[PDB]
Amino acid sequence: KDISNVKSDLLYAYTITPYDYKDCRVNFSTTHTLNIDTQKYRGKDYYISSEMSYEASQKFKRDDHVDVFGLFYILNSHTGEYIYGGITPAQNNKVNHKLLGNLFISGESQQNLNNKIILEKDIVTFQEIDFKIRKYLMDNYKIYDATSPYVSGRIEIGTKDGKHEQIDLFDSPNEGTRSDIFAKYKDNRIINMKNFSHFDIYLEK
Amino acid sequence: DTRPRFLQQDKYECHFFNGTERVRFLHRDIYNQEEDLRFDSDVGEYRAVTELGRPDAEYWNSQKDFLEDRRAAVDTYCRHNYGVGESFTVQRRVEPKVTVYPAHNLLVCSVNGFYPGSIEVRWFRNSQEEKAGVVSTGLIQNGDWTFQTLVMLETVPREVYTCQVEHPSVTSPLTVEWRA
Amino acid sequence: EEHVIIQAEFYLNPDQSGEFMFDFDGDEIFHVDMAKKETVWRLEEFGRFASFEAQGALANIAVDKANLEIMTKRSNYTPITNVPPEVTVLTNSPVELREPNVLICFIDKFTPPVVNVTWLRNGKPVTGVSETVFLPREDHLFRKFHYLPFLPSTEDVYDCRVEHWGLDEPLLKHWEFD
């Protein structure tokens, strides 16, 4: 899977506007799924179906109020909208978290990307964090452009406990479609900013 | 050689408390040896430590920018590096190695090649932890991430006294008896 | 204070020699060589666990030199008070005939990080290399560790000859089995 193909798949996959509906009800809840009534946003009888692992698929339950933030993998499907994870306990009080970050490029000098990304939730999904950082990286470093040098790199989510969680930046499994690329988000993994220390970026070539 | 020397030391230091619960960053500009300029998280801006360093303090403090980068080192620098080395520094353990040899008879217990420096050495006689009449070299830095220390026991021989050593790299206390 | 990591760097004149390094809880995690421009691990194995862009340290050094000039003047040209080094020669392990060992010559509490160390067996100088870089002391002085692997005997009498602009005469240290 020559990186050359990896890259374009990501570029194309990630050139997208996320679904970002705030404080919506959960109509029903199963395992694989979780129904959310995005009625006060899109339209009459519309909604959002978030696909997610069992573990995660069971913490939420009907009537629940939640925040959606997911990258789609299918469209023009009537009244429905489908994503993987992207669900966190709704945020009630306004907040703002300027993220701190280091940008190491194999070859160039250290550079830091502090306060260049702002999260507006206390509890957030790695999806949401992963998305914005990538979008930023794209918008300025063109990390997925056919011409971009970078042959590889990753994201490290630094916690205050002193640990890092990797998130490969050039990884296109299977066919390499938004469905393949965006299904790792099933785990609906989240994080509490009280524990987010900083993030690190690594780019080779 | 009578040519004078003019030195300039810079120390960027990180202090960790309870793992990485709460850290502290501190930058120290040092001309020759006097710490003239400073900067402490607990403070937030550069402070002068000696008149010689004020000119700079006011300067850098005028660049809000550069001052945010330093304010964020407890995160992007300290906790980070702590965690980048974690695996081979804080979690480093290296089993000692004790031997016994006679220096009022003489006894000397040598604890070599261990790490960390937190360690405890004991002198027992048949059935008692004789804590009296024993000099020690204290903990000594070797330069290669390993320490050493010698505890000198002072008694008259006859029986069988032994060195008991317990260090964070071995749950079951290590032992070495000396036939007297 | 459970642990402290220190990024210690200096620049001296007219020697025009810098040094950059990380000190963890006491030891040198690693240092950058201004000569070969290559990060050098105190423990060769560390490199397998982490990397550090050597080029980076040299940048600072550049800056540091400059600060020296700009500070040298500002201080109305006042040099550095030589501060003698307190030598000392311990042993890597309990000496025991023929069984390989190491003589350590711990130089500590000196400040102009400039020194000269010579090893002596019987009397004639002995060479290969083996030494650390100027480690820092909470009082901004220095301590350096020099090494020499020897094969214990009783005939030989080793010597660590420390030369510093502190003592008006070289500093010698004797050592031998028993």
């Binding site: - | 850098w60 | 990380f22 982490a50 862009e53 980076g56």
Partner: peptide, 10 residues
């Protein structure tokens, strides 16, 4: 692999 980060001196 990981990278030790140094405080850039301005």
């Amino acid at each position: 692999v990981h990278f030790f980060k140094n405080i850039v001196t301005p």
